[PDB]
Design a binder for this molecule. Sequence first.
Ligand SMILES: [Mg+2]
Ligand SMILES: [Mg+2]
Ligand SMILES: [Mg+2]
Ligand SMILES: [Mg+2]
Ligand SMILES: [Mg+2]
Ligand SMILES: [Mg+2]
Ligand SMILES: [Mg+2]
Ligand SMILES: [Mg+2]
Ligand SMILES: [Mg+2]
Ligand SMILES: [Mg+2]
Ligand SMILES: [Mg+2]
Ligand SMILES: [Mg+2]
Ligand SMILES: [Zn+2]
Lengths: 177, 66, 82, 114, 101
Amino acid sequence: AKLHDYYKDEVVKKLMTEFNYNSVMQVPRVEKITLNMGVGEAIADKKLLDNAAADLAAISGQKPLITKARKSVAGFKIRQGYPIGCKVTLRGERMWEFFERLITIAVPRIRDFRGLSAKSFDGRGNYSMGVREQIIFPEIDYDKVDRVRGLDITITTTAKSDEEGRALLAAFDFPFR
Amino acid sequence: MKKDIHPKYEEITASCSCGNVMKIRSTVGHDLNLDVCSKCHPFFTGKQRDVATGGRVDRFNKRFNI
Amino acid sequence: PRSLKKGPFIDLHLLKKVEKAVESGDKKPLRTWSRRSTIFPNMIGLTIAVHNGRQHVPVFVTDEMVGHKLGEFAPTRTYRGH
Amino acid sequence: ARIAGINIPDHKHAVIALTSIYGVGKTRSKAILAAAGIAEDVKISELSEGQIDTLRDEVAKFVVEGDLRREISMSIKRLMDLGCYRGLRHRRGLPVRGQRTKTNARTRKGPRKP
Amino acid sequence: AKQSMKAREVKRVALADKYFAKRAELKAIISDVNAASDEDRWNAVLKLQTLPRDSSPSRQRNRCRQTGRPHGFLRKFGLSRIKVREAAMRGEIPGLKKASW
RNA sequence: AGGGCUACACACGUGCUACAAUGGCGCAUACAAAGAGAAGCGACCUCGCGAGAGCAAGCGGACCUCAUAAAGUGCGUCGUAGUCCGGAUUGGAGUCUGCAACUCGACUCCAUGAAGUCGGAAUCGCUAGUAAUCGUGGAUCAGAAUGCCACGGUGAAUACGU
Ligand SMILES: [Mg+2]
Ligand SMILES: [Mg+2]
Ligand SMILES: [Mg+2]
Ligand SMILES: [Mg+2]
Ligand SMILES: [Mg+2]
Ligand SMILES: [Mg+2]
Ligand SMILES: [Mg+2]
Ligand SMILES: [Mg+2]
Ligand SMILES: [Mg+2]
Ligand SMILES: [Mg+2]
Ligand SMILES: [Mg+2]
Ligand SMILES: [Mg+2]
Ligand SMILES: [Zn+2]
């Protein structure tokens, strides 16, 4: 919410002045943040998914979509349709809340945070960063932790290119080493 | 969103040691009081400037004898 | 651990080297043999390479290892397994 | 009889029961009952409710189960994230402070493998 | 004792008893509590450690006075158990005898 | 100069510590012997929960110190628990020696409180101030013993016989 208002006025203002745009609609929004945990050990510990799911539920307040193996992959000993992961999509007020929480609490709390990347865009201005420790998030109690499973995060933006993606994120004060 | 499947998501205050206190509607369960923040962090405001209040100070500076 | 009435310890040559590094240093790691020296908060951000017995293993100095000595991060006894 | 989140036993004298808190041994138990003025020759049975309550907030003046677990586990985790010698020892599952491993390392090595 | 080791211990006693009264005052200053501990102790520690290591009395092994033997030493007689028994049975050690009580 | 002799899937010897009530724990009070000391023992008093620290007399020693013996005895608690047994681990904070205690010192305080329920085949020591238990000193020693060498306190059972 707070970070959304900060966008709507200050970041939209600076982005318009920076890109020389004719329409406010032509500035990057953000679609969603999809938090993914490709557990891949559920085949070993079926329970380990409900515990990992319990953690995305913890970090972001949505029950997670427990996703299944799209097709059979024998190398990883997984068939088609087995629940080898769990994800959440955060969009809207809730996405803005989580985004604020991340940037203001967890991105500093990473182990000796030497910085984030600046190339982790698909090629149209959609960021994708992966965190190596679940503990960085405040929500975790460590009173209910099995292991130190990290996760990744995709900031899906309506941006046109990687330049607009970087512009939008840096505008939000992303560390961006 | 749906009901009776999502955790509790009330409004919680998180206060860091440098005076950065942030209001965030979050899912923790009770008040929070953290140490680092997006402000009181080296790489976030001053990467070659910042100060700390821990193993670089308590453990060493408090006992320092120079 | 070393008494407080004597404070911490660091070899004088190493101290001179690290203070040179944090006063005008942008060049090269510090190849030292003083495994017995307590880390300073000055060297935080340095890449001292401390003698493990046969070589010098580089160690990027982090502010979570302050009251620690240069020999906690150099291993002396390699052991694959039985 | 419900201090700190645990189920401190009755029929034990004051100290003998208060030892049960993960963070409260004999000395800290005597100190808790000292600040609480509670005699150590009585159980946690015949203590009025207010006695249990003052014991509660003095136990909370001290450190308790969840926070002790968290602090010591995070100390160990800081060690093993630091990657120091003691971190390596905790990782590998070997004696940490320099004890004997050729023989007599069992409480820290597990029972005998082959 | 290899001769070199003997000469080592000779030079070690020599440098210890030479650099004495300097190492000792530095130790007193470090063990001391006063002088605000700012430059007194934090400079005495440095000066002490930079004093040549040979100057410490903690590098004397107390070898046998004759055979340079590191182990089995007795300070009283200054000789290993071997040379002690040798001279004590020959009779070169005064007042010494096989006790039996 | 640093490291290793301290490395650890393992197996054996010799010991220490237990697994408890003939005990643990608090309080109160007894009774030793033999030693060692000067680049040493270090009163006292005071500070510190403690390790210890400051101060510092005395003593080359039947004089001073190390040095308060313990088990014991009285008083209570525990009530047979993996426990108020056990004190291994591990964390945190220190003290002392030494230039320096990370690999790799010893102690101290707090908390953490594992194995362990008297131990298979087999195997060991001891015929009396002995075994068994309790404690103290030395040498080596800057610091570093559960080892070794000494010393005392209680103090048994049994030996038909070959
Ligand atoms: Mg307890
Ligand atoms: Mg020596
Ligand atoms: Mg010789
Ligand atoms: Mg060995
Ligand atoms: Mg065995
Ligand atoms: Mg015992
Ligand atoms: Mg004498
Ligand atoms: Mg047990
Ligand atoms: Mg237990
Ligand atoms: Mg006989
Ligand atoms: Mg005896
Ligand atoms: Mg009889
Ligand atoms: Zn801050």
